[PDB]
Design a protein around this nucleic acid. Sequence first.
DNA 1: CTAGGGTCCTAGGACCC
DNA 2: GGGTCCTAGGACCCT
Length: 342
Amino acid sequence: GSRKIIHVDMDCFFAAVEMRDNPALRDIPIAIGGSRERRGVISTANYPARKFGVRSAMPTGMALKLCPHLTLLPGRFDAYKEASNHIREIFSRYTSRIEPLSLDEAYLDVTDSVHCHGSATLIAQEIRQTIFNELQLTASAGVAPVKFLAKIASDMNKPNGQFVITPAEVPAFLQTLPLAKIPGVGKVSAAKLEAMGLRTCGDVQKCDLVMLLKRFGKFGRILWERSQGIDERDVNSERLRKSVGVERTMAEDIHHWSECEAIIERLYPELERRLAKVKPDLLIARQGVKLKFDDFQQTTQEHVWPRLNKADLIATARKTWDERRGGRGVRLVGLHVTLLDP
DNA sequence: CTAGGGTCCTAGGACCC
DNA sequence: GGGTCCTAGGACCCT
Ligand SMILES: [Mg+2]
Ligand SMILES: [Mg+2]
């Protein structure tokens, strides 16, 4: 009863696309991200930039201190979406059991596959080769009996490689696995776990489930399970979008309601255009707004509402402005919609 | 020197039983 | 008191 899960993951995705489309960017340090003047961050970087320490989510000013010649690109999201659609269609040549997680990666359940004599190792390799043909981008892959190990495995031999974890290999792999490598255990959790002496899955195996449940709730059950290679989550090909949002961080903090309202007037057409692609009649379940202040606290207020409406978003933003700003400056304004259930 | 696109979980009061 | 909805906040995911 052992499944075969593939996780496929594009290498330096946004950057790989810009270098394919402009070969002049191949050997110099490049990064997709907002300028230092726009108070931006790095979305991703190529390997020449990463050598300097440039990483995703790094503030762009820090990226530039590490790497003064970093070439900064704004991003061509239709080009990334196009490559994304292409690799998903390549995935469909092998199975319909496809769960995309973002533009550039998916899980594949090839347990019941007929291709490559049932070899998941060879399927992953054929998919990676096919993506390099046809798109001229490289992908890495991970093969394992459950999702999270497959996703960990696709990181271990990148770029342009893969890694297979067999059931017999799972116990040795887990013993020294840092908890922070499990998808969904982030910096805050890893720090709480470290402070109680839990660094690796081997550390957590020596823990009582009941204690984990008390100290972490349902997360503690996930931790206990994952530390044993237990991950019964099925590959789900029927997930649907639940929200759509449009927000912007300004280059300077704003301090006047007129500035905030002016921001909303530019954001609203974008939100309407993106909703309409998926919901022509603009019918929704909730809509709402987001402010982030200069102390980086952020607040949202959203409410049941039947149909995208600009004035109500202005009105709600006005209240949030008056009622929870407390005289602080505002670095970000955002709009938001929750989509109807079906 | 701190983005923009999202998902999922938690938690208190409202409302319903 | 138990479901479920409503809303807010936050950890976390991707690039
Ligand atoms: Mg990637
Ligand atoms: Mg990815």
